[PDB]
Ligand binder design. Structure first.
Ligand SMILES: [Mn+2]
Ligand SMILES: [Mn+2]
Lengths: 294, 21, 294, 21
């Protein structure tokens, strides 16, 4: 069984507590959340097609109490429809509570809650940057492998009313038609190069005229003329993405044709940045909601 | 079909600020 | 062309100098090192078959000065044949001088100098643990990708006089016959799992009767029983490996049926360990030569 | 025809030590 109300309740019960109180669910409950949510991810299309109104968040990176502050201001599900753009674990202390509360809502409201895959929702990355460590200390190694099998079926991109294109990373030189995105057959591992790798790793750059090499050593960088031609060929108007920490929680690119979202404020304590989320009304009009520390 | 718009284009404030500690 | 003597000369020029003095070879000199050694690596069997006497080293990890100290004691090539178990880059301040002097000697005496592939000779690892950062700083990204295409061709294991089996990591559950090692065609990436992954990632553990899950989240731990049954099946007397820092640079296991080597003393400054290398003469008798800080 | 042996087996010194700083 999955007493999900008891799970979501025991997670939200620490709301307002002193910072630093963990939520240790049972190994078989967390194991059940992965299987029941993986069941959902594979049933839904790999290229999600969503309808507004919808609230879009960026990266979380294990800042669970900061994920809760996002929900009180944005409305706890099912108040507003939600779509996340990956990067839920790592670089933060509470990665397990973060992904569990996100996996919990995805099961409770499977048509009003949505999660995309990020480059940190991959085995070879979260092993190093602190998520697998969080599994080792509080649970066992096999649970982290259960988490990997769940991430290996997350959707990659989401198209909101054929005018907003959402993904964690950015554009891909090998991306010519949406059928290439649907042609990807889950479960999948994120490769080191190619179409699937680029959608989770590429960055925008104002200095590149075309496709340039990325500093991360993975994927490429695209310029303002790449975004404009892409929106033009697929009758799109906006590219929403994350994958890059921004000072104001939001950062525009290519004359507002693209925007970078980062939802984790005070990211891992080495920046003083703020976290923002993008709200979308019925008329595809967008408003930014920002969390700023003082 | 509906096209994307922004709050600053229609006069609405684009940014809504919330603070914590 | 390849002024190989000049390259070795400028690399050995910092012998006895103050710690931290680099050797900046030109991009074309380094690119020539990778391309000519990769030619040698692909010609020599992926499973090396060497003859004693020779001296085996473990992990250097970009400790270039410490590598020079190892060459001082054991003799500079070609005074003694050398076998290295991998992990030349990463964690060290001078990964470039380390790998360059190693690949240069590999071209200079390809029949008396040998290099095996470690788990850090992979694009997914050295991109994170300092080597790729060291390539961006002193050179360009393209050199790092040229280094990767050379590491993908390093040989995996060696058998010395049909009695000493040598690899970086350790045994593998899938490893049944030596033809399976030779079957692997180069170049390849260090895969996510399997025979090649374990040969570069597995460790020996005393508390495991058989195969158990590894702490790193990659590969397995094997026990003293697995060592004995493996040696008995292939008529081998000793397994020589590295991949793990040990206090005295050398460490026995399973009643001297396996030895762990680690050649980098004061491992990146966070350990008070020592560095050692194993000397095998023509009688297949083993001596240890240790470098220790005071 | 051959067999692996060790210096400690024959009474020789197994380890050769060098110091530096
Ligand atoms: Mn990212
Ligand atoms: Mn290693």
């Amino acid at each position: 069984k999955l007493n999900l109300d008891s799970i979501i309740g025991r997670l939200l019960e620490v709301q307002g507590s002193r910072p630093g109180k963990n939520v240790q669910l049972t190994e078989n409950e967390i194991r059940g959340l992965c299987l029941k949510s993986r069941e959902i991810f594979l049933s839904q299309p790999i290229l999600l097609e969503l309808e507004a109104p919808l609230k879009i968040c960026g990266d979380i990176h294990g800042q669970y109490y900061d994920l809760l502050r996002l929900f009180e201001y944005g409305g706890f599900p099912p108040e507003s429809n939600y779509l996340f753009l990956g990067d839920y674990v790592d670089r933060g202390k509470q990665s397990l509570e973060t992904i569990c509360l996100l996996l919990a809502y995805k099961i409770r409201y499977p048509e009003n809650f949505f999660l995309l895959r990020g480059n940190h929702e991959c085995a070879s990355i979260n092993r190093i940057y602190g998520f697998y460590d969080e599994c080792k200390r509080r649970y066992n190694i096999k649970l982290w492998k259960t988490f990997t099998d769940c991430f290996n079926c997350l959707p990659i991109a989401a198209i909101v009313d054929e005018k907003i294109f959402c993904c964690h990373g950015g554009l891909s030189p090998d991306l010519q038609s949406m059928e290439q995105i649907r042609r990807i057959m889950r479960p999948t591992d994120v490769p080191d190069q190619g179409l699937l790798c680029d959608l989770l790793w590429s960055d925008p750059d104002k200095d590149v005229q075309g496709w340039g090499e990325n500093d991360r050593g993975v994927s490429f960088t695209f310029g303002a003329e790449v975004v404009a031609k892409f929106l033009h060929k697929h009758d799109l108007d906006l590219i929403c993405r994350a994958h890059q920490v921004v000072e104001d929680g939001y950062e525009f690119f290519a004359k507002r044709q693209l925007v970078t979202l980062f939802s984790a404020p005070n990211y891992c304590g080495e920046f003083d940045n703020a976290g923002a989320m993008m709200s979308v009304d019925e008329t595809l009009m967008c408003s930014f909601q920002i969390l700023k520390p003082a | 079909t509906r096209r994307v718009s922004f709050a600053d284009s229609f006069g609405f404030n684009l940014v809504s600020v919330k603070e914590f500690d």
